[PDB]
Amino acid sequence: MLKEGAKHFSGLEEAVYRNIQACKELAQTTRTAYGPNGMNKMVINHLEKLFVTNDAATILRELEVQHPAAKMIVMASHMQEQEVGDGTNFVLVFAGALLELAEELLRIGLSVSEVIEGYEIACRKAHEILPNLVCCSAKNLRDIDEVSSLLRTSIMSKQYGNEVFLAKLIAQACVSIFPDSGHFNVDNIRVCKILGSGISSSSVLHGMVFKKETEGDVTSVKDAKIAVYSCPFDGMITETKGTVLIKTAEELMNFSKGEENLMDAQVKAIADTGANVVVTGGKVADMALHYANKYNIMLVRLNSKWDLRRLCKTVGATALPRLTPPVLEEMGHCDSVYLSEVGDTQVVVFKHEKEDGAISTIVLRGSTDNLMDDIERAVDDGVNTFKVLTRDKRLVPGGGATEIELAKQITSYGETCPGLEQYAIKKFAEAFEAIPRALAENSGVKANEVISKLYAVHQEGNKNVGLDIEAEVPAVKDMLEAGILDTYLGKYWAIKLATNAAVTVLRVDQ
């Protein structure tokens, strides 16, 4: 410090000034990353891989900050995304916005706990009138348009353009196929992108979609005893000799000949271990394959760990290297195991669909993965934005209409409450306009226009903004009445989770 001593990278300026700005810049990024937007954010991987997303965690995961300020909070949006779909892109910016009001209060000189609680106080008050903001609920999780109305939002909350057929195809993916009664599966619902055709051509094949080539003859039976193996055939031969070819010459002709029936042995012992399909994380072996064509064992020449994972995951499979006649451990699960061509590629298909073991695997056709990825980003969320696991989600206005609703409400209360508590509770209901300011930008207007009307629309639980010309001049959309709605749930979370850190992240000056 003044001394040589201790350990801190926060405090003094940092706590007040630099953390808030560390609490700023990325929220600043997330502002048009959330909600209806035409904003787009390019990203390169550790792969150096050029990609664009308005999703945070993707961007987030590769962001390092000396402060915990930016660092620690992102778990909440994940803690959020652990719970649901998007609203995550809203989570942090909600914090960051309402935060930097406090550094102003720090300029105004308000005490931490004095700054802290009024939010927390009103954080209830949000959650308290938040149910008063339930304008609908989720009727048929089997219905497409029941669900598509929602799914459009997190996609919208991701990106504006593609939301509709997505919200359609995702319910056409049949989020229907689960009760979602507390039983819902995104292991049984997988987004598997075919590189090819269009994304409007993207389908959903219920049952496991493995774009991996269906190798040789299809499954022995459709209730497939499945041998999932990391390396089932590594080759049975070792050629090391005098020349590692021939020195005593006939000693060569043994093993290249004696290798393949060991692959037969293994493959026969694939038929002998009983696998109706064998699965190679390693390579296929052609003679073996030929034997597996004789034995008509469906095979996969090569298997991603991702493949093997879901394979090992859902089958009850265990991917193993085997230089031995194989042993079924993996066994079966899926009661129909097929070959599909979607984008006209061999699709290894596994379907047991029970409404509970029910596999509806989204199969994305498209000529670009980055395409189908930033897609799958919103598609990641929509399904798990759909995934509330309340069949009745108490649908609340989408798009951020509920914001201004409580802007009036809780600051009107924030008015009523006394003391330094006021601005704490008052700044609280001021935290909304950020995105109504943020998307108002990409919409193309100032937020006063937005907010004055978003105020002048007063209590609606409809009238709101986004990326739109409705979001421009009117400061009016239907972020309820148009079919854009939100589950009651992530609201509570998008509200609560960020409020906690914004409180908490300041309190630490270390």
Binding site: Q66, Q82, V508
Partner: protein
């Protein structure tokens, strides 16, 4: 490199403030959290005086030296290290003022002691002897946890605290090295704080569905190998003797199906039914097919136990330990009136609970499993030692500075010596006491001056112990409020504050060399 005398003392006293100041709310509910991403270079969260010290790699000897003696209180109380640093440097502030004006460094160090006594005498004088009930301990629980966490967070914590120690007060053990069993659990929220009067079993058996609800718990804690191992193992292991391996293949599962039958018979001896629950817990691996035999008998036969858990199993249940299940009387195994084998997440954490004669009480917390989930575990755990002191001392007084003034008063209200000489020490000494409420009150609110003249005149008017509203800055009767100082805690750190402050006042050079 060297600094002499005056120049030596500066680096000492100068190092204190900023260091000291960070803690100006480490105590009471107003206490502000502090995050190391820098301590080892890892993201963390902490409030305690001594703990934060050791946590950060702390480069300065000043920072270094008290943490050693600050270890004592945190060893003893666990908190007030959250406190003591504050008076210490403020005390350091006082003595220099003389030497600043000039005065001999001895006599000031010299004048602290009768001061250190007459104030400690005031401790005898002020100490409020209280008859501890769970409620008294509840407010003792929350005063240390407010120091730690939200009074909100202090709430669900308080229960298990005063309840865990509640069964050790039965044991008439004034200290707790048992019922300190704590558990953390996979959750979205660290809010959950659970209390198991028994234990919780980390390991699940490799066989599920053995006895999933063990009602009557008959626990043989067993080192036993019910996995000797099933195939070729010689002594139980592979080796270079085929001749021995040739003999040693068969007796394996025989020695096992022995211990199988040794449990089989045991179960039916312990039970004769699957109705009464039953438990086997191996310190090592078990054959699942042993389990398969046993899992179908009404046992939950468990494996690879941690010798620590075995104890609280052997003890809180009154459990037992053998190398051969043989048969033992049903009662011959320790007991928990219910056992609840519990999966949250993917792992069954078996609650052996209301373990008969619990000496141990298990405190589960479910959480996000972050240093958040840590910031709760540490929080209760020093309050445990704090509230443990209330078992120790029958005298608990309130905190929030209700003590300080009235203590700082007398020795200031009169020169305890009626020496300037001692009062030199004393006025230096007796002054630093006020640092805690006066910053906390101003940390939370108005300038110290008012509350000071309040709390003083109040105590002067009252003699009732009145203390800050730690998020306001206004004095409130702190006894009734519940912010409470063990006569253990405060007295010690008092000593701790002064006992260090002397010879460190006495460092008249420091050379960098060794």
């Amino acid at each position: 490199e060297v600094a002499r005398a005056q120049a030596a003392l500066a680096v000492n006293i100068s190092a204190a403030r900023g260091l000291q100041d960070v803690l100006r709310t480490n105590l009471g509910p107003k206490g502000t959290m502090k995050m190391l991403v820098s301590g080892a270079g890892d993201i963390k969260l902490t409030k305690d005086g001594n703990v934060l010290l050791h946590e950060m790699q702390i480069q300065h000897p000043t920072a270094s030296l008290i943490a050693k003696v600050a270890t004592a209180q945190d060893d003893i109380t666990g908190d007030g290290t959250t406190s003591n640093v504050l008076i210490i440097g403020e005390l350091l502030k006082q003595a220099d003022l003389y030497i600043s004006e000039g005065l001999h460094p001895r006599i000031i160090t010299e004048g602290f002691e009768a001061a250190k006594e007459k104030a400690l005498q005031f401790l005898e004088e002020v100490k409020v002897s209280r008859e501890m009930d769970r409620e008294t301990l509840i407010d003792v629980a929350r005063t240390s946890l407010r120091t730690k966490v939200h009074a909100e967070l202090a709430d669900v914590l308080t229960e298990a605290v005063v309840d865990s120690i509640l069964a050790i007060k039965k044991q008439d053990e004034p200290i707790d090295l048992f019922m300190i069993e704590i558990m953390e659990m996979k959750h979205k929220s660290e809010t959950d704080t659970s209390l198991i009067r028994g234990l919780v079993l980390d390991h699940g058996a490799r066989h599920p569905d053995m006895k999933k609800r063990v009602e009557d718990a008959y626990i043989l804690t067993c080192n036993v190998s019910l996995e000797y191992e099933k195939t070729e193992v010689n002594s139980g292991f592979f080796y270079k003797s085929a001749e021995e391996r040739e003999k040693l293949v068969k007796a394996e599962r025989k020695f096992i199906e022995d211990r199988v039958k040794k449990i089989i018979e045991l179960k039916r001896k312990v039970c004769g039914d699957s109705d009464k629950g039953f438990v086997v817990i191996n310190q090592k691996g078990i054959d699942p097919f042993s389990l398969d035999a046993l899992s179908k008998e009404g046992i939950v036969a468990l494996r690879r136990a941690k010798r620590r858990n075995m104890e609280r199993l052997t003890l809180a249940c009154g459990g037992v330990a053998l190398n051969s299940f043989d048969d033992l009387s049903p009662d011959c195994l320790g007991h928990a009136g219910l056992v609840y084998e519990y999966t949250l997440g993917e792992e069954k954490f078996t609650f052996i609970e209301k373990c008969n004669n619990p000496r141990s009480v298990t405190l589960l917390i479910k959480g996000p499993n972050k240093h958040t989930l840590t910031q709760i575990k540490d929080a209760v755990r020093d309050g445990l030692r704090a509230v443990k002191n209330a078992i120790d001392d029958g005298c608990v007084v309130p905190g929030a500075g209700a003590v300080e003034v009235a203590m700082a008063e007398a020795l200031i209200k009169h020169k305890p010596s009626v020496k300037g000489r001692a009062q030199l020490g004393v006025q230096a000494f007796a002054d630093a006491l006020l640092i805690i409420p006066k910053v906390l009150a101003q940390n939370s609110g108005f300038d110290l001056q008012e509350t000071l003249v309040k709390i003083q005149a109040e105590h002067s008017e009252s003699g009732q112990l009145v203390g800050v509203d730690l998020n306001t800055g206004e004095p409130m009767v702190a006894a009734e409020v519940g912010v409470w100082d063990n006569y253990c805690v405060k007295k010690q750190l008092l000593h701790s504050c002064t006992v260090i402050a002397t010879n460190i006042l006495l460092v008249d050079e420091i050379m960098r060399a060794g």
